Amino acid sequence: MFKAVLFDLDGVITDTAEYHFRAWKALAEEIGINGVDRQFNEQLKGVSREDSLQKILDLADKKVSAEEFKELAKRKNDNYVKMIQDVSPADVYPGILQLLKDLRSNKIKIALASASKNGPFLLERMNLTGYFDAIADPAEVAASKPAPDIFIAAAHAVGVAPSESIGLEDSQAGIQAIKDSGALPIGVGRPEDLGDDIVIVPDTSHYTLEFLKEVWLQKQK
Numbered sequence: 684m685f686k687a688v689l690f691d692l693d694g695v696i697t698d699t700a701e702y703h704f705r706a707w708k709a710l711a712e713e714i715g716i717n718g719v720d721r722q723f724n725e726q727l728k729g730v731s732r733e734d735s736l737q738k739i740l741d742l743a744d745k746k747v748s749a750e751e752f753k754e755l756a757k758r759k760n761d762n763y764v765k766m767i768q769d770v771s772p773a774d775v776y777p778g779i780l781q782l783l784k785d786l787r788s789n790k791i792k793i794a795l796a797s798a799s800k801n802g803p804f805l806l807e808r809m810n811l812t813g814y815f816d817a818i819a820d821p822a823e824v825a826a827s828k829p830a831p832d833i834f835i836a837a838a839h840a841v842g843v844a845p846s847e848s849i850g851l852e853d854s855q856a857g858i859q860a861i862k863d864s865g866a867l868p869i870g871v872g873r874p875e876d877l878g879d880d881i882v883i884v885p886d887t888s889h890y891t892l893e894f895l896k897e898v899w900l901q902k903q904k
């Protein structure tokens with residue numbers, strides 16, 4: 684009986700979490716911060732551009748100037764934007780296109796709840812824009828992931844209560860944002876990274892409408 688699905692983008696719809704990681708690691712190393720490895724990057728997944736940069740700068744003893752802070756965020760974004768120019772429909776993760784088609788057939792709303800300002804560009808790259816009933820603008824919320832605001836806004840944008848929605852996420856921060864919104868999270872990734880307390884699937888082929896119904900029917904929510 685859920686009425687909406689609230690999609691993260693990066694690491695859910697396609698493998699762009701890998702590109703954010705590579706770009707943040709390159710930035711960090713340029714400023715002599717070598718701690719952005721895959722384990723540290725689990726604290727960056729789902730986190731805004733500025734919050735990501737500050738989590739990396741927290742690894743250093745000294746502060747950068749406000750001018751350098753702004754430059755660094757822009758530097759990373761310009762690199763990332765170059766990395767994603769060749770993304771195509773062939774890069775949609777397994778299961779995702781068919782899930783979008785099945786949700787529309789079943790009159791279940793589809794909304795994007797990505798913290799990325801590059802979200803709309805990436806949905807166009809992948810020929811997915813037409814499936815979305817709404818895209819929650821991440822610059823409109825007052826509080827970014829792990830705050831629930833973006834999931835609350837995604838649900839509102841398609842006229843469904845968060846409590847009647849499922850959220851799909853690959854990150855610690857986004858799973859917390861889903862929990863605090865009222866929606867039911869189903870994570871994608873390693874249990875070791877995302878927790879043993881919610882439903883986690885190992886890859887996105889598991890994100891079928893059949894499975895979302897299976898999970899919803901057992902407590903949920």
Ligand SMILES: *P([O])(=O)([O-])O[C]1O[C]([C]OP([O])([O])=O)[C]([O])[C]([O])[C]1[O]
Pocket residue numbers: 691692693694700703704727728729730731732735760796797798799800801802854857
């Ligand atoms: P999700 O994974 O919330 O689709 O995206 C998150 O977006 C932020 C901000 O991206 P931007 O605006 O393109 O710089 C990234 O820092 C996170 O890595 C990403 O998970």
Ligand SMILES: [Mg+2]
Pocket residue numbers: 691692693694695700728729852853854857
């Ligand atoms: Mg993500």
